[PDB]
Design a binder for this molecule. Structure first.
Ligand SMILES: Cc1cc2nc3c(=O)[nH]c(=O)nc-3n(C[C@H](O)[C@H](O)[C@H](O)COP(=O)(O)OP(=O)(O)OC[C@H]3O[C@@H](n4cnc5c(N)ncnc54)[C@H](O)[C@@H]3O)c2cc1C
Ligand SMILES: Cc1cc2nc3c(=O)[nH]c(=O)nc-3n(C[C@H](O)[C@H](O)[C@H](O)COP(=O)(O)OP(=O)(O)OC[C@H]3O[C@@H](n4cnc5c(N)ncnc54)[C@H](O)[C@@H]3O)c2cc1C
Ligand SMILES: [Zn+2]
Ligand SMILES: [Zn+2]
Lengths: 466, 467
């Protein structure tokens, strides 16, 4: 809210930065406009300097200068973050990883990838898929998000159900600390219990403890067969039983279980002009499988589908194994987030709740907000207990905000839930962590912040309470 | 040797304070304190004069508060199955045992989230969740004695790591009591939660130097409908590696374990524990487990895998079992190697991560470098994870053999950019060999964390960071 007492970038700093990163000092005001606006376009900084380093040493030397001079630094990846973490609040220097986009190694047997933090996820998937491997994560933002940003936010995504957390799949990190110190935790070993797992501190630290410059990550083998079932369910009770049966009948081949409601389908059709492949239903379920024997998987899917259609859990369904049609079906889920931001102003919540009542809050909000909201939708990673709750209006209303907050956060807390399951904290949620974290935890976080960045030059105004 | 730091000593008034804090949980008898003072390997012995056995988190909080005010050093202990001297005192540190913190708090029968006290015994937790058709995400030969809190503190790997991965992924939350007695509540029994720093991660693998784990929340995978085990003889290590490659290619996602052992391992388990080999004599053996939803499909995958393995000469003889009794018998041949080694003599133990292609090289080398001074040398362990268990046995400890083994084994590992402690951790034994696997700047940040969280250093002194 109020600017902390940081120094201001002088002409001497610009000349220093040009020496440190020649060719990588952008000061054109119109060029700085885009990197100052977050993905949602509701926060806008006034940074006048963007730095685009190529190597880790350049990053180390930049922070060295910023440390001695007490200049605030805003690390930025793909700028797809959802919580206002990726753009300055005032005039923080934007340090972009855009040019740190080289792959450093890939071991063709272990599947271990070492790459720079600014490699785009989409591009890394292509690289390892040419070598019969896949990334352990995927997101709708794959086209723009940087692997460094994924690690900094501890991104979940669409294959978390199968491959799990970056806390498990990240093997090593190189991090540049606030004072310029290069921390080498860039191991490429599957197992290494020689002291504290220091890298874990930086996974989910959202650039407040250091800038990730190099990532080592374990890539799963590429599946021989990927199948997608897109199913229509007549209610949420059946969605939950479809999930239960899916785990019983598909089991270890399951790689994704996503859901969306009717309004979500309508919004992707209206704003993005993507047609539904099944009959209209109140709820839709996208199931993905990944396995080593295509015939065994297809056999598992067949028996699962026949009984689920037979027991009335699903009303209408379409299956796909052709690469083109799988991506078609995935687009119906992946592009919901785009359709919402085209419907007007979006109030965005990312909650962890008990799966058995994951949708109850959507129905509650629909009764609580009547004609004062345009749409209320619920979708997301049901398999991981993670609901994406969004309310749209043609324009922002302080009334509607007062109706949504703190009510939504209080409901989640009554369920011992998380007020930010995946997207993190950043600027937007810094003052609502008390609904998921007790004061002693939040205090220790501040002590770690004070140890690693005593001057607070890395990402001020985030991601800890005011 | 190592010098005792200037901690206070336990007085009669401290003993009365502990009797107040945990009624009936103070053990002072020297004959009762012998056993908790000796490590599993029986090569380190402490001189602790008091064992505290709290039942509740509040009791642990109050104990540590007193020790912090009094400047009394504390040695946390679980099952005392640790392999690196971290589990017993060096001098007269108070032994704080989790033996009586053995309650399950809750288990959600759909999400599979378990919450239990740190001192619950792994095998007992497995029995509890398996009755409800879930399994623990980790298993190890120590299951009968090790505590879940110990496993988290050591970041235990084990026999199903290849399938379910690290505790850094499967632990959902922890309650931890800090050195000053502050109860840190990171007990987030949620699959996903990105509301600030993942504080629990600091305590996974910290071996009781940053706090005492009192409650664990852990994600339990579903119990597989079908479990198969194959036990195979290979004519050389190259065929072992090709058997692994082929195994991943043909079994894929149903693979739940891949373990190897050498001929000498098989001989010792047979010689000391009387377990007969079910396959023809071979220089290497491989145990494969599969876990899946469809018995028929898993059987077809396994049938074709063996067909191809026997066809191309990768495996010379093999047997398969699905009967629960027979499955356990095959698993016993691998699980009980560690017991058989310590009955054979004095054991020099090394736990190394290396490039899988050269995992066994060190065993051949050491067999040549040493001579009749080694009674036996073996190599076995978690090949799928790149993890070798190197052991050398002898009739008695000798300085000459230790000098031949060290630093040579640690230099070999650094030469391969490997880990000198893959899973067992650091503790007392390896505190001064971290330079082979971790750079100075990383080692410094760990010391700063220790100073922040335990500025008096009362929690597990003489471990697990460098001097
Ligand atoms: C269409 C869409 C779909 C999405 N789907 C998902 C999803 O399924 N799951 C999910 O979890 N999230 C999802 N997200 C949001 C997700 O958090 C981001 O897309 C991504 O994880 C962040 O990458 P980025 O390069 O955009 O990082 P940025 O937005 O540039 O940065 C995000 C934060 O991390 C910090 N940071 C970035 N890079 C670094 C670095 N190298 N070192 C240190 N700190 C750094 C920034 O300072 C900021 O605080 C989605 C976003 C969009 C737009
Ligand atoms: C037969 C056998 C097989 C084994 N197999 C494996 C294997 O497959 N994989 C593997 O990784 N290891 C294995 N181990 C060793 C492994 O380190 C231990 O078995 C186990 O992980 C430690 O559990 P514990 O409760 O016995 O811990 P302890 O031995 O009691 O303690 C170990 C360390 O953790 C600390 N500690 C213990 N409890 C707590 C607590 N509640 N809070 C904080 N710190 C605590 C202690 O202070 C000590 O430094 C094996 C050991 C044996 C004897
Ligand atoms: Zn998401
Ligand atoms: Zn082991």
């Amino acid at each position: 809210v109020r600017r902390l007492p940081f120094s201001t970038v002088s002409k001497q700093d610009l000349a220093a930065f040009e020496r440190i990163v020649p060719g990588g000092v952008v000061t054109d005001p119109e060029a700085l406009q885009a990197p100052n606006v977050d993905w949602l376009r509701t926060l806008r900084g006034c940074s006048k300097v963007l730095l685009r380093p190529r190597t880790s040493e350049e990053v180390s030397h930049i922070l060295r200068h910023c440390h001695e001079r007490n200049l605030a630094v805003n690390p930025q990846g793909g700028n797809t973050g959802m919580v206002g973490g990726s753009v300055p609040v005032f005039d923080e220097i934007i340090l972009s990883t855009a040019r740190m986009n080289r792959v450093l190694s890939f071991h063709s047997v272990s599947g271990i990838l070492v790459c720079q933090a600014g490699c785009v996820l989409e591009e890394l998937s292509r690289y390892v898929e040419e070598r019969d491997f896949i990334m352990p994560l995927d997101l709708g933002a794959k086209g723009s998000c940087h692997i460094g940003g994924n690690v900094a936010t501890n991104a979940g995504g669409l294959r978390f159900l199968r491959y799990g957390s970056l806390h498990g799949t990240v093997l090593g990190l190189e991090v540049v600390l606030a004072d310029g110190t290069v921390l080498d935790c860039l191991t490429s070993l599957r197992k290494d219990n020689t002291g504290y797992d220091l890298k874990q501190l930086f996974i989910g630290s959202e650039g407040t403890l250091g800038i990730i410059t190099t990532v080592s990550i374990l890539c799963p083998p590429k599946p021989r067969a990927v199948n997608v079932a897109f199913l229509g369910c007549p209610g949420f009770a059946e969605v939950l039983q479809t999930f239960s049966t899916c785990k019983g009948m598909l089991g270890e081949i399951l790689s994704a279980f996503e859901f969306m409601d009717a309004v979500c389908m309508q919004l992707v059709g209206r704003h993005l002009h993507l047609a539904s492949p099944v009959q209209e239903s109140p709820f839709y379920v996208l199931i993905e499988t990944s396995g080593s024997n295509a015939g065994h998987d297809a056999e598992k899917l067949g028996h699962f589908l026949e009984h689920a259609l037979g027991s009335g859990l699903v009303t209408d369904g379409t299956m796909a194994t052709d690469q083109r049609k799988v991506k078609m079906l995935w687009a119906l889920r992946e592009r919901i987030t785009e359709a919402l931001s085209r419907d007007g102003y979006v109030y965005k919540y990312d909650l962890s709740l008990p799966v058995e009542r994951l949708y109850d809050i959507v129905t509650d909000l629909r009764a609580r907000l009547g004609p004062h909201a345009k749409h209320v939708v619920g979708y997301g990673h049901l398999g991981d207990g993670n609901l994406h709750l969004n309310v749209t209006a043609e324009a922002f209303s302080p009334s509607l905000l007062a109706a949504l907050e703190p009510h939504v956060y209080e409901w989640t807390a009554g369920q011992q839930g998380s007020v930010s399951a995946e997207h993190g904290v950043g600027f937007r949620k810094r003052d609502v962590l008390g609904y998921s974290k007790p004061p002693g935890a939040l205090q220790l976080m501040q002590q770690l912040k004070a140890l690693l960045d005593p001057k607070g030059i890395l990402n001020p105004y985030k991601t800890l309470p005011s």
